[PDB]
Point group: C5
Chain length 310, copies 5
Amino acid sequence: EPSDVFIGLKIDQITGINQKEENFSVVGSLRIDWRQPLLAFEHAPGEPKHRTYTLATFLKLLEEKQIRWPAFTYHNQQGRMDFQNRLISLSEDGTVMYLERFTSTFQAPAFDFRLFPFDNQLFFIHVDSIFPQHLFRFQEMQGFSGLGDQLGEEEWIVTEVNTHLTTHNEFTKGDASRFVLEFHAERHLNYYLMRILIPVLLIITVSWFTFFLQDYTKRIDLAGGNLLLFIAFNFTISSDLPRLGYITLMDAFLVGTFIITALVVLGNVWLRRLENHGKQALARKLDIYAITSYPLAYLLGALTLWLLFF
Amino acid sequence: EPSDVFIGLKIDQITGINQKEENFSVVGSLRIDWRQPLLAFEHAPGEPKHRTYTLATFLKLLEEKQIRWPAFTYHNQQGRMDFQNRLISLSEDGTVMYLERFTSTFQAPAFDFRLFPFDNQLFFIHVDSIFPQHLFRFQEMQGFSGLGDQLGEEEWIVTEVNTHLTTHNEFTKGDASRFVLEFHAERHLNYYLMRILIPVLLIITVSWFTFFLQDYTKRIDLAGGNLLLFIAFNFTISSDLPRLGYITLMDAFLVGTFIITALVVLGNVWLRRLENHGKQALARKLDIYAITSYPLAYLLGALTLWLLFF
Amino acid sequence: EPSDVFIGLKIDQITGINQKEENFSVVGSLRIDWRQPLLAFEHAPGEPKHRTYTLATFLKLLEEKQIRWPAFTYHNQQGRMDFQNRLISLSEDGTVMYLERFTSTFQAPAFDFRLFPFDNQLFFIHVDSIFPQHLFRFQEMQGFSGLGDQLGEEEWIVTEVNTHLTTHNEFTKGDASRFVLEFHAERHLNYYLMRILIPVLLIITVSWFTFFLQDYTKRIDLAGGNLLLFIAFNFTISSDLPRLGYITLMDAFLVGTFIITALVVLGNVWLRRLENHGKQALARKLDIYAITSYPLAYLLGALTLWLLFF
Amino acid sequence: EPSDVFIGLKIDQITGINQKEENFSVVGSLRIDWRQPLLAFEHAPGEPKHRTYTLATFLKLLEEKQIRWPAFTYHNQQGRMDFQNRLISLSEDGTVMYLERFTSTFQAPAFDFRLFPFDNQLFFIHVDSIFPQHLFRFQEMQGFSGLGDQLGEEEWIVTEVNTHLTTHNEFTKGDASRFVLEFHAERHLNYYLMRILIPVLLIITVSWFTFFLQDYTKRIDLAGGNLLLFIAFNFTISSDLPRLGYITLMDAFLVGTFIITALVVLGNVWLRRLENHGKQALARKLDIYAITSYPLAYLLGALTLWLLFF
Amino acid sequence: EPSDVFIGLKIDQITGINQKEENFSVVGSLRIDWRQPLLAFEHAPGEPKHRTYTLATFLKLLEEKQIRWPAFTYHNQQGRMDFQNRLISLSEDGTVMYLERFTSTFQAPAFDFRLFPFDNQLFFIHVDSIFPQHLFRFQEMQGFSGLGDQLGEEEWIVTEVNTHLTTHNEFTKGDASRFVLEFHAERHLNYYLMRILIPVLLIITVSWFTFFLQDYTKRIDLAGGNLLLFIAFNFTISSDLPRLGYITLMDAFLVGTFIITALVVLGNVWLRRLENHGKQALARKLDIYAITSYPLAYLLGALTLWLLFF
Ligand SMILES: CCCCCCCCCO[C@@H]1O[C@H](CO)[C@@H](O)[C@H](O)[C@H]1O
Ligand SMILES: CCCCCCCCCO[C@@H]1O[C@H](CO)[C@@H](O)[C@H](O)[C@H]1O
Ligand SMILES: CCCCCCCCCO[C@@H]1O[C@H](CO)[C@@H](O)[C@H](O)[C@H]1O
Ligand SMILES: CCCCCCCCCO[C@@H]1O[C@H](CO)[C@@H](O)[C@H](O)[C@H]1O
Ligand SMILES: CCCCCCCCCO[C@@H]1O[C@H](CO)[C@@H](O)[C@H](O)[C@H]1O
Ligand SMILES: O=C(O)CCc1ccc(Br)cc1
Ligand SMILES: O=C(O)CCc1ccc(Br)cc1
Ligand SMILES: O=C(O)CCc1ccc(Br)cc1
Ligand SMILES: O=C(O)CCc1ccc(Br)cc1
Ligand SMILES: O=C(O)CCc1ccc(Br)cc1
């Protein structure tokens, strides 16, 4: 019949989440408990009941004994996995206890930036068996898997963590076991508030103050630079993310500021054209719409994206 | 006679395409099925019909048995190939089943940016046999090769994928086998629309609004900065790409905006010179050409590149 | 009974502290003294009393003799540990003397930027025993552990260093030994003085000089750009640090400059509106509040953060 | 007498040339043919006439047979050399055929930027024998060495390629063999035309158009910003290159634009000072020199560097 | 008694000096000549008098023969040392000749930027013996150590090179041998002249030309932006260097330009205030101090730092 292989995986550190590259990096420990009766050994009185091996001399021992080990792969792994510890402890019984401490980057293919920066994402690690379920069946090692207390991440905040077993058909026709460690994390909005919301709101508010000067030309020059500032901010936000084929809530907000600013230019050009054509008195009356449009326009726009996305 | 070696290659992830360096990076699995009758082994009843080996003790076994393995190379490979799994399963028969899970950057020499960002490119992986076709003939392993479901790429979108066998003469006089996994991908234009087309169009449109002010000096100062903005945008686009010896559709568009902006300065200088020489009334009549040239000039220019490239 | 394992750890160099990534990197030496009576050897007269081994042939010797070594891990390690020396010197007695020279990045999870740049941080290295205290008990090797004379760091300045032993339960039910090398460091404020305090103070002071011109429009244009400069400075500071979910003393200072500058615009708009509405004489009298507010506002704000944080 | 060792080296890819770091990187294959009569073997009928080995078990075989191999070094190598293939094929004869596929960065010490961007450089690879010419004499393997068809470089264009043998005295008193693969490459000027020549020429030309406005103050403000733009461009060019102790043709061009721009400011200050001192009519007559100096100054300057450098 | 171990170290390339990180990187060769009479071997007539080994099988041979090797460490090493060659040639005598070709980054703790860019620095490599002087005494291998002819560095220029032996107490109570290869290098000032001195001098000079316009407001606006430019230049210089706790000659120069520019604003505000208060004729007389202060102020400041630092 098939031998049960117990998989445990604990993430100790989140060394970073790279959203631009849709990957994350962690320091973690993998724990395997697999009982192979052929590995059983007799000991003379006094000598150890538990043999401890390096991985290299353990695999070599398996090859001599013609024993197949539950060869596994981190399916969503990326690049190099720098190992710290790869140790085996073998009991009289045949109970092999394996520990693998590593640092690695993993694929984050579940990334959805539609609501960025208000988004919540799913990150996971797939531990696949190369051999099919008729030889080795993966089971959940009980008191081990999950995320630590000192992960070191400052922007993301883990909302929930889960482990579950399933199947894959990567190398074989028959189903093969897959252990999954999943977690969900959401953003600490402070960065976004401090670096984007407050500067953008400041530019808008202090620019509106200048309307009380009743200089239409001065408004035009101001809305002109404001438009460039928003174009600049637009590039800075573009930097954090991949070259997505879809519109972000952030993109919508930025395109929104462009449109209002464009109309601010357009409108004040008209008011200055009235002034120029000897209808200065009229420009002055209409100016009340000009002054009160500006705040309403941005507030209307803000409710529009909020409805349009939530 | 020559032994058939079955090659399979599956790309699981596109970790990135670096167009500036004309290379791409992938996580993939290589699968080899090669029957060597000399590798055949006898087993006593009950014992394994399938011996499983690490790559190191398998090659050492070949060297003892004085057996030549189908030594292969990833011809278009770049730098380090970080391996995850290099495992061998040997049957009584001599059927060696090899699996190689790796992460690697590969050369993308097929890169043609003439129509960028509207371009479609070809990416491939060459798996060459070091030994000639009289010793080892490469065959396509049937249900394996291709690209996965979760590649993780956000800008490129795979239009088609193919596998085919051919020959090379890299190390030998005689022809040697080459397995090829090719794919074509094209861009998600959203990034370009959001970061380049809309900002450039905004600068142009809102700058045109100001013509209704009938201040020629103000137009000159505006077209002056606009020219610098386009020069800046020109550098930002230069960043994404190599220092090509050829003109991009993007380069054409940018050079086009320079020329129109240059003439906008030139023209408005003339209109302001008429005004200055007591012919203000004339500048005012001609101004209608000045106002309507601007939109037509850019629309004429836009049809010109489109014809000139498509 | 359990065997005492003596741990010594000396940091020779601080290759860098990366605050944006909340990690630090060091070149160091680990020293272990562990007496295993089973390792004892007899020598014929004249031959060595001290056998010297590479780590690889020492571990292989342990595996033959079926001896369990005090397998240890650098708990807060990050990525690769580039080794220089991994040497063993074994006495007739069984006294194994191990030396491990390495370069490594470590996690700095103790990072608190609330008072940045006036902050003091704690950095440490955890050396855990994989095996529980009933088998191996970690002890402090006496004349070795600590930090060197040539660490090479220029901004941080080590205020204090300590070593202490404790316990962890990482792999086992029972307590396992943990050796800790801690140090505290604080910043050399010069960089911050030269690049941030002096430029910001200059912008403010020379901008205030211009108030003696009695041009309200000119003040408005100046406070407008000043606001953008501070927004720029705000991004430059954002660069050095993680995307924290909390307010830095530095953030407070920057938000403070925004508010005063915003009011500088607001106020001068009012004074210019009085001038515009034929009350130029009144604007002139009030102007004395306008001139003296500016210095007081910034000095009041400076005492406010100082109280609010200290 | 000394044994002839045949060296072949083929560069398959130029992964990049880093001029700022004066190094280049390539994917290449090294081929060695060396006949050692002591390596000769007898085979029983039917068994292989050609033994194939991994490098590791081949060197171990040499050490048993007490055979010295022609130990070689890539003299101008830099950092890590990521190997793909290191394979040996040994004939009944003793003919050892070695293949080494690698990716590596090499030193480019021949770099002369005096005529940049119009420069032509020399790049090479030195393959030195550790042992002197009395033991091993390097010979050129005939149908192999050189550069490929798909190098992947876009800016450089290989003008010529050569191989030659010489001597070095690196480790020994006596001469030791050195195999050299050299190539010369020159630049595709398009990047420079598109990003530097056209933007600089545009700034100059459209700035000259404004002279027809006959506003001296406006010219001064324009030449002021133009000077800053050129200072900016100067830093952008500084980026591509090392901190050379010599003047580049590019440096000369940039310093040239500074001087003319400085005089443009200087001159127009004088013309505006005449206007200011009631000699407006005189400023107007001299203005024709002012208008025609500008184009001549830059064209005169362009012939001056061309003569001064070619 | 103790065995003499001859150390030779030749730096072939300076791959770079990173002043921001206070480290340097080199390609070099280490040469060791150590005579161990126990390593002596007998050969039958005709067979080799010199056995050649890989490092791995040489160390394994030492471990069998129970011979202690002079284990050494590059004390100031940083990260990974990418080896090219690690070869041993053993004579009948016992004369072991070791060669170690490597690429490595080393600590530069001797870095003093007080006179930057006019500074001269000391760079070195420490080769320590792990074992004390009673076992192994380090001696200088005669015709080998030093720096090469093609180092590839462009900014630094090696003023002098030295080798000397001393002692350390890193791992032991007793003194242990240390071989030292030191060199001093100074800067090629061209980069600094071209990118910093000439642009700063240009800004100052062409800004002074504008004083001949007798527009105080225009001077104020100019000195305002000039101050920002210097603040920008200040950040660009900050980039090249660490976050030092001390004042650089460069810092002094920059702070100097700030002060003069600040006073230029201050002064011209006063002159414009006289003009504003109907004392235009007085502003005009004082203006001669205003015009001649500017050049003297900067020349006075330049002699002040020169005295203050030299
Ligand atoms: C910009 C936000 C601050 C607004 C406060 C009003 C005073 C003017 C600030 O300088 C402004 O900066 C813009 C951006 O570049 C320019 O387009 C504009 O012409 C210029 O007047
Ligand atoms: C710039 C696109 C927005 C146009 C809207 C009209 C109002 C003015 C906006 O500021 C302008 O910015 C240019 C770019 O730097 C400067 O050259 C120019 O002198 C300045 O007036
Ligand atoms: C800026 C600090 C120096 C103040 C000295 C007064 C002279 C003017 C300096 O240039 C100013 O720069 C600001 C920042 O961008 C712009 O908003 C403003 O319109 C412009 O006049
Ligand atoms: C700059 C090249 C374009 C010239 C066309 C004339 C219109 C003005 C363009 O804006 C100018 O930009 C300069 C560079 O920053 C500033 O110094 C200058 O005061 C400003 O007027
Ligand atoms: C700047 C060095 C060149 C001086 C030559 C005099 C002409 C004006 C150049 O443009 C100036 O650029 C400054 C820097 O941003 C601005 O503060 C200032 O308002 C603006 O007038
Ligand atoms: O091939 C390798 O490197 C590791 C594989 C491995 C498989 C099963 C156990 Br239990 C332990 C290790
Ligand atoms: O030399 C190597 O590292 C790998 C080569 C290899 C060749 C054939 C088979 Br089947 C498996 C492996
Ligand atoms: O497994 C390893 O790489 C190193 C472990 C080790 C454990 C105890 C001593 Br004493 C020395 C070394
Ligand atoms: O020492 C090494 O790694 C490689 C050296 C080498 C020398 C001669 C032949 Br032929 C093949 C290889
Ligand atoms: O432990 C190592 O890797 C290298 C050490 C070494 C010591 C002495 C000689 Br001679 C040669 C080599």
